[PDB]
Amino acid sequence: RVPKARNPTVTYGKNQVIMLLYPDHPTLLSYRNMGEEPNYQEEWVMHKKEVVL
Amino acid sequence: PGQFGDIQSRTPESKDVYANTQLVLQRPAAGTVHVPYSQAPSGFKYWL
Amino acid sequence: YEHVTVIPNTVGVPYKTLVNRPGYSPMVLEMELLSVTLEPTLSLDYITCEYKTVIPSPYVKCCGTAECKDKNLPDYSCKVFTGVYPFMWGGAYCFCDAENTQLSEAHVEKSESCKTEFASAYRAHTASASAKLRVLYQGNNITVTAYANGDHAVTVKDAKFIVGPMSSAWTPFDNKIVVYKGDVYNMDYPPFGAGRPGQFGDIQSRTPESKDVYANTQLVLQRPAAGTVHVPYSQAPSGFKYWLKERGASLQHTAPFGCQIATNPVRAVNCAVGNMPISIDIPEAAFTRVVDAPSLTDMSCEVPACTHSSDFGGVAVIKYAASKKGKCAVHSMTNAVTIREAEIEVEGNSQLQISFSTALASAEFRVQVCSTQVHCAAECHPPKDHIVNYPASHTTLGVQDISATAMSWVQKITGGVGLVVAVAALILIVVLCVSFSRH
Ligand SMILES: *[C@@H]1O[C@H](CO)[C@@H](O[C@@H]2O[C@H](CO)[C@@H](O[C@@H]3O[C@H](CO)[C@@H](O)[C@H](O[C@H]4O[C@H](CO)[C@@H](O)[C@H](O)[C@@H]4O[C@@H]4O[C@H](CO)[C@@H](O)[C@H](O)[C@H]4NC(C)=O)[C@@H]3O)[C@H](O)[C@H]2NC(C)=O)[C@H](O)[C@H]1NC(C)=O
Numbered sequence A: 001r002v003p004k005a006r007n008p009t010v011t012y013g014k015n016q017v018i019m020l021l022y023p024d025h026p027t028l029l030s031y032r033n034m035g036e037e038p039n040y041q042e043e044w045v046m047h048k049k050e051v052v053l
Numbered sequence B: 001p002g003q004f005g006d007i008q009s010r011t012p013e014s015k016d017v018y019a020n021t022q023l024v025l026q027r028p029a030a031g032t033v034h035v036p037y038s039q040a041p042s043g044f045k046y047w048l
Numbered sequence C: 001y002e003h004v005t006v007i008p009n010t011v012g013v014p015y016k017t018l019v020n021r022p023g024y025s026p027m028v029l030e031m032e033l034l035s036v037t038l039e040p041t042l043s044l045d046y047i048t049c050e051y052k053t054v055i056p057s058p059y060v061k062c063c064g065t066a067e068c069k070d071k072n073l074p075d076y077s078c079k080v081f082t083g084v085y086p087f088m089w090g091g092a093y094c095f096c097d098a099e100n101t102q103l104s105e106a107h108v109e110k111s112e113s114c115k116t117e118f119a120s121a122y123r124a125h126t127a128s129a130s131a132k133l134r135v136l137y138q139g140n141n142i143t144v145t146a147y148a149n150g151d152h153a154v155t156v157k158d159a160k161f162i163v164g165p166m167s168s169a170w171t172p173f174d175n176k177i178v179v180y181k182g183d184v185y186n187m188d189y190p191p192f193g194a195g196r197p198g199q200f201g202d203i204q205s206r207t208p209e210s211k212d213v214y215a216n217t218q219l220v221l222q223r224p225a226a227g228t229v230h231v232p233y234s235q236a237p238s239g240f241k242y243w244l245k246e247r248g249a250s251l252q253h254t255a256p257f258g259c260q261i262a263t264n265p266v267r268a269v270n271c272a273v274g275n276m277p278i279s280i281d282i283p284e285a286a287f288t289r290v291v292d293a294p295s296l297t298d299m300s301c302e303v304p305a306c307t308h309s310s311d312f313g314g315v316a317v318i319k320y321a322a323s324k325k326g327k328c329a330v331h332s333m334t335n336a337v338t339i340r341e342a343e344i345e346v347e348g349n350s351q352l353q354i355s356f357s358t359a360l361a362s363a364e365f366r367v368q369v370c371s372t373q374v375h376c377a378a379e380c381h382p383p384k385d386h387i388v389n390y391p392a393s394h395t396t397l398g399v400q401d402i403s404a405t406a407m408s409w410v411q412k413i414t415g416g417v418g419l420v421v422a423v424a425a426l427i428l429i430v431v432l433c434v435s436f437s438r439h
């Protein structure tokens, strides 16, 4: 059994998603484009953090 | 939610409490009686 | 009746095709890809798993010298050390003060945890595609599942469907694949018998039950510490655990075109690459003669609102006069506008409402209902919500069906510049004609 992180707080902007993240433990956040070039990126979040994608 | 001011009240003794903590109830796990939820942690503590 | 169509490989977006048999009421079929599964053919080369170093007890021979015979074990080494004086809990091992020898031998073999904890290295050659399809056939929702190689035909409601082959051969797998449990990695693993110490593939075997083990771990024995009977050794730690601690992101999270990856069997699911041909055979019994189906005349179209959002933001109302009550297919005559409804119920003189989506600033299109065409025109406004969670239901605008109704600025500027150029060319022609006539 592994836990599920809290729901991030999501806001929107012109071709932007702004996510506020509240991890209890170091949580892996990754994202990729779903086109020809995924441009996969990942990072470990240890504390509350705001990410603009 | 999750920032300074997620819960507010006019005075410490007032019973008027405004709360925006993004509280979403989740499905309990099979075979258990717990009440799971996904709630943004206290913005006051994060500010502290 | 045989009908040939092509639909994009996008999953979860329905597409509508028009089965048009002249002399019969046209039909509209809505097909949606629920899942496209690519299952490649895999040939196993070897499996890599944690090794264990089997070290028998040391052989302490005093007033003597031990020798070891070279054995053919996967990675086997003997060393005899001289001048050892081992101690027990009680005292010295034996009377013999010097010239004592200790033979220490060690080899490497697959740990029994290889039965469960292992990573397989496969070769991927070709992919056999399959597809699950939801079809709106004569107002009924039917689900089919069939191979997408263009070879398998599936029959539902006496209608035959041939799906594929997919127009693109792209797959997220390159030639060499590593499968651990449920994570597929795209890695150039070393060939069998060429593994290197401290990396992936240090210990290999052709099959999980094969006794043939290729181990390359730089296993070197070292002299035991004075007054101790232990067997020290210098060995590169297991390459499988090393690979596990730095696996990186598996293909499930970095595959292009948003492919999902599954294992047992290894599948690539919902890859939105290229498109997919579909051939449809419909019985002549399913068709209906035009004289029986309703016919619509005195038909006009008006759009009260249009919003070129990813959802169906546009609404059109069509006034019609129906000869008889019944169902009728509705289809778009342009590729830039997608109609949500597939069939409407019509009776008498009335009006009907349809929902549509588009990307055009000025939506100018035509709608066919019971072989009657109506030209709809509208000005569409952009939405206020920046981001949505669902793919666009309309097709993208290209290079021909472009611009808005306020393209008349382009026409005006082109006409003005062309008029200036025409005036200059006319003056030049007049002058040249005068000069040529004059001599
Ligand atoms: C914990 O859970 C894991 C996974 O859930 C279990 O591992 C599974 O163990 C099974 C038992 O061995 C594996 O099943 C078979 O294992 C064979 C070992 O030799 C393996 O060779 C088999 O694979 C062949 O057959 C498949 C049939 O579809 C083929 O797709 C595949 O490519 C293989 O084909 C062979 O290819 C070579 C290459 O030339 C040929 O020479 C052979 O002739 C081909 N054989 C056949 C039959 O065509 C088969 O998988 C199972 O694979 C394995 N799981 C995984 C993911 O690999 C653990 O056992 C479990 N733990 C415990 C304690 O039970």
Ligand SMILES: *[C@@H]1O[C@H](CO[C@@H]2O[C@@H](C)[C@@H](O)[C@@H](O)[C@@H]2O)[C@@H](O[C@@H]2O[C@H](CO)[C@@H](O[C@@H]3O[C@H](CO)[C@@H](O)[C@H](O)[C@@H]3O)[C@H](O)[C@H]2NC(C)=O)[C@H](O)[C@H]1NC(C)=O
Binding pocket: C139, C140, C141
């Ligand atoms: C044929 O199927 C389509 C697609 O729906 C799929 O098939 C159905 C049988 C169900 O298994 C669905 O879960 C599945 O995805 C049907 O179109 C969809 O119908 C559903 C309900 O009929 C619509 O859901 C509703 O949507 C409204 C608006 O958001 C909500 O308020 C409702 O609470 C409900 O969720 C869905 O929007 C709709 N989708 C589209 C693209 O039209 C279709 O109705 C069905 N037809 C027949 C005759 O069975």
